[PDB]
């Protein structure tokens, strides 16, 4: 049968977790206008020649909401850790999300991808090489994305699936 992947998108408020998830699943960019909440989004894709089902949990970046935190972190198979390249604080916050995940999973080897989003904007304060250097320290892939243009979006999620598959040997 088809394998399903429970992917969890985490990161600071406003970095574009929802917009990435909606661009991946629905192929359009949300900004000014209203939208209905779902929080869990599903998609069939072919990655490296194997069809699979993606189940994406789009988490809140507000720290005051975390009832599901140890929940959705416990049920997730891999994590997209998102910061925005114009938000130094959200890049600094990656450490805290990676530590939360490691604790909840009780593992030093959790499938994860570091995502630097909003790479269409000119106001960059996080250098690509600095984020690459951090991802190398963790041993995980780094991808730059734009939910506005779709640059990198498929690649970020598919790379996470490839990390889960590699882990599962
Ligand atoms: N220029 C640009 N703006 C983006 C990009 N991704 C998201 N945004 C904008 O940034 C804002 C925050 O995006 P949103 O997806 O709601 O962020 P979030 O991480 O889910 N927020 P929260 O943690 O509050 O749930 C929105 O105005 C959205 O249009 C991107 O790649 N480029
Ligand atoms: Mg959101």
From Swiss-Prot:
Q: Which residues are modified by glycosylation?
A: 36
Where is the major localization of this protein? membrane
Enumerate the Gene Ontology biological process terms: actin cytoskeleton organization; cardiac muscle cell proliferation; cytokine-mediated signaling pathway; epithelial tube branching involved in lung morphogenesis; female pregnancy; forebrain astrocyte development; gene expression; glial cell proliferation
Could you say what the effect of mutating residue 62 to H is? In lung carcinoma
The record, for InterPro entries, names:
P-loop_NTPase, Small_GTP-bd, Small_GTPase, Small_GTPase_Ras-type
Keyword Cytoplasm annotated: yes
Task: State where GTP binds.
Answer: 11-19, 30-36, 60-61, 117-120
Q: What is the effect of changing residue 13 to R?
A: In lung cancer and bladder cancer; somatic mutation
| Consequence when changing residue 62 to L | Promotes GTP binding
Class of enzymatic activity (EC top level): hydrolase
- Family per similarity comment: Belongs to the small GTPase superfamily. Ras family.
Q: Write down what this protein is called.
A: GTPase KRas
